[PDB]
Amino acid sequence: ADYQGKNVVIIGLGLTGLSCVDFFLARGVTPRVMDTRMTPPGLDKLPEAVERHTGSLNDEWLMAADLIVASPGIALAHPSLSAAADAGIEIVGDIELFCREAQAPIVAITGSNGKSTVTTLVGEMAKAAGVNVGVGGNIGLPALMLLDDECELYVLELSSFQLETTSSLQAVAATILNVTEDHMDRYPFGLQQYRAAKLRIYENAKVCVVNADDALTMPIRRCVSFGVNMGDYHLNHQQGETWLRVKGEKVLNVKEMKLSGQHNYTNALAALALADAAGLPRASSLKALTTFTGLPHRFEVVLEHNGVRWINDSKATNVGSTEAALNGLHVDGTLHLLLGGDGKSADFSPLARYLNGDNVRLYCFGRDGAQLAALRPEVAEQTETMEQAMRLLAPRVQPGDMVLLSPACASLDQFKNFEQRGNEFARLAKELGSH
Ligand SMILES: O=C(O)CC[C@@H](NC(=O)c1cccc(NCc2ccc(/C=C3\SC(=S)NC3=O)cc2)c1)C(=O)O
């Protein structure tokens, strides 16, 4: 693509918006930047040569543009963006710009849960094969910063939002891992609209990898599949042993993995299917499965001390993710479960089946704390903040207990992101969980 001489407007700054600014400048195009936040993240790092408008969108600049580059954090349905689309002004995102330039195959991964873990795993599979791999696409690692003529493979975690503005992806292997209700605040036509955004990932993909146990991951109209009992890649349970299998052949006894639990086992299957389709050697891919230790904020044990395990699962930002942490969970004594934040209009009721019995306490906070408490008011406390919740529950904690942050909500009402929320939990857990 050739951007020379174009009037380019970037909407949304932060690290990703900055990556877009730098992309155009390096190509001899000076873009303009706008952000509805008065002082968005990264403002101080924008060069002074770049004109910017903050605190609102500027329709004069939008309607004059030849190309709009929209952050995934701004809805395409925003009136100012829809007016530009109606006028025939091209709108893309950073991932689109990346796909137009990439000179290595792309493995593309989305889904409501698991997409970071799968993306990181396939990255480790590539490294174990000695392939020069670029891994990113999420908040901390903008895709455009990965671009490098020496890269031999890219592995991208993509959100529904990024996919909405992407049209040139031709993934060597693409997956939707699962679709469970999330981001309803951005999808006013409901679950099927959210699904449709994710289905975009399979367009022009060489291999599609679907979840045999989740029909919403399947194109609406020859995909490779993974599942628990069913699928080209599936699990084989005999004795107390679990195996990863491909078409009936055993490939790995999961005792060799550091990760544990059924959803980690299906994540490993999806990652193997992707790696296989991308041409990576199977034997090195299996090696990577044995060495991978998990991501921070993903059911991460931050302290095990005095008979109590404190678990940071701050990356549980929707109901399906919390349900994965609770489903099959073993607790010797009482589970003290922290819920709260911006629930984005989600139906929390699917959590209710996990919350019966004498050994559960809920500590609910943030924007939607009252609705979370209402799942079972007799075992629930509500506070404004997570720190208040933590200081309220810590005196009640007994040897045998588990304290679990798995909030089912975004952190954005009170924190910069789920990583800051996790880090604060870990700090308080270390404070409160010893003498
Ligand atoms: O961290 C959490 O707790 C939420 C996790 C959960 N994040 C998002 O829903 C999400 C969606 C899109 C973007 C970002 N992260 C970067 C970003 C954050 C805020 C903005 C806000 C903008 S842009 C603009 S113009 N005006 C704004 O307010 C833009 C980009 C986050 C997810 O990954 O599922």
| DSSP letter for each residue of 72-137 | TTS-TTSHHHHHHHHTT-EEE-HHHHHHHH--S-EEEEE-SSSHHHHHHHHHHHHHHTT--EEEE-
CA-CA distances (angstroms) from residue 259 to 73, 268, 365? 32, 9, 30
Q: Are the beta carbons of 41 and 165 closer than 8 angstroms?
A: no
Counting Cα atoms < 13 Å in the Cβ hemisphere of 234 gives 15
CA-CA distances (angstroms) from residue 237 to 68, 224, 234, 242, 266? 51, 21, 10, 5, 13
Angle subtended at Cα 16 by Cα 38 and Cα 421, rounded to the nearest 5 degrees: 75
Distance from C-alpha of 210 to C-alpha of 353, rounded to nearest angstrom = 27
Q: Are the beta carbons of 307 and 296 closer than 8 angstroms?
A: no
Q: Are the beta carbons of 109 and 88 closer than 8 angstroms?
A: no
Q: How many CB atoms lie within 10 A of CB 339?
A: 30
Cα torsion 91, 93, 99, 102: sign:
positive
114 is in an annotated binding site: yes
Spell out the residues 6+ positions from residue 56 whose beta carbon is closer than 8 angstroms to its own: 34, 36
Task: Give the strand order in the sheet containing 8-11.
Answer: 52-54, 32-35, 8-11, 67-70, 90-92
Q: What is the DSSP letter of 47?
A: -
Amino acid at 159: S
The SS3 assignment for 366 reads coil
The string of DSSP codes covering 312-354 is: E-TT--SHHHHHHHHTT---SS-EEEEEESB-TT---GGGGGG
Q: Are the beta carbons of 360 and 378 closer than 8 angstroms?
A: no
Among all residues, which ones are annotated catalytic? 115, 138, 183
Counting Cα atoms < 13 Å in the Cβ hemisphere of 422 gives 20
Domains of the chain: 1-92 (3.40.50.720), 93-294 (3.40.1190.10), 295-429 (3.90.190.20)
Distance from C-alpha of 376 to C-alpha of 392, rounded to nearest angstrom = 18
Q: Ligand 1 centre and the CA of 184: distance in Å?
A: 14
Spell out the residues 6+ positions from residue 305 whose beta carbon is closer than 8 angstroms to its own: 433, 434
Distance from C-alpha of 30 to C-alpha of 97, rounded to nearest angstrom = 16
Structure tokens at 161: 């939002």
Atom of ligand 1 nearest to the CA of 318: 34
| 67, containing H or E segment | strand 67-70
Resolution of the structure, angstroms: 1.5
Q: Are the beta carbons of 176 and 219 closer than 8 angstroms?
A: no
Compute the residue count for the chain.
435
206 is in an annotated binding site: no
Q: Ligand 1 centre and the CA of 416: distance in Å?
A: 9
Cα torsion 152, 160, 323, 241: sign:
negative
Q: Who lines ligand 1 at CB under 6 A?
A: 11-12, 14, 35-37, 71-74, 139, 161, 317, 410-412, 417-418
Closest CA to 17 of 59, 71, 65, 56: 71
| 11, containing H or E segment | strand 8-11
Spell out the residues 6+ positions from residue 240 whose beta carbon is closer than 8 angstroms to its own: none
Q: Are the beta carbons of 194 and 111 closer than 8 angstroms?
A: no
Q: Ligand 1 centre and the CA of 254: distance in Å?
A: 35
Q: Are the beta carbons of 115 and 99 closer than 8 angstroms?
A: no
Distance from C-alpha of 308 to C-alpha of 400, rounded to nearest angstrom = 6
Q: Are the beta carbons of 326 and 356 closer than 8 angstroms?
A: no
Closest CA to 334 of 275, 403, 427, 280: 403
Distance from C-alpha of 317 to C-alpha of 138, rounded to nearest angstrom = 14
Q: Are the beta carbons of 355 and 334 closer than 8 angstroms?
A: no
Q: Are the beta carbons of 217 and 176 closer than 8 angstroms?
A: yes
The SS3 assignment for 289 reads helix
The SS3 assignment for 217 reads helix
Spell out the residues 6+ positions from residue 3 whose beta carbon is closer than 8 angstroms to its own: 24, 27, 29, 67
258 is in an annotated binding site: no
Ligand 1 atom 14: the closest Cα is on which residue?
73
Q: Ligand 1 centre and the CA of 340: distance in Å?
A: 17
Phi, psi of 405 (to 5 degrees): -90, 105
Ligand 1 atom 7: the closest Cα is on which residue?
410
Closest CA to 135 of 158, 103, 114, 113: 158
Alpha helices in 226-303 (DSSP H): 262-277, 282-291
Counting Cα atoms < 13 Å in the Cβ hemisphere of 13 gives 24
Angle subtended at Cα 271 by Cα 287 and Cα 225, rounded to the nearest 5 degrees: 130
| 16, containing H or E segment | helix 14-25
Residue of 46, 62, 74, 295 to mutate, ligand 1, most atoms within 8 A of C-beta? 74
Cα torsion 413, 334, 180, 262: sign:
positive
Q: Is 416 left (phi over 0), alpha (psi -120 to 50) or beta?
A: alpha
117 is in an annotated binding site: yes
- CA trace torsion 388, 394, 396, 401 (10° rounding): 130
Q: Ligand 1 centre and the CA of 73: distance in Å?
A: 5
261 is in an annotated binding site: no
Structure tokens at 259: 């990760």
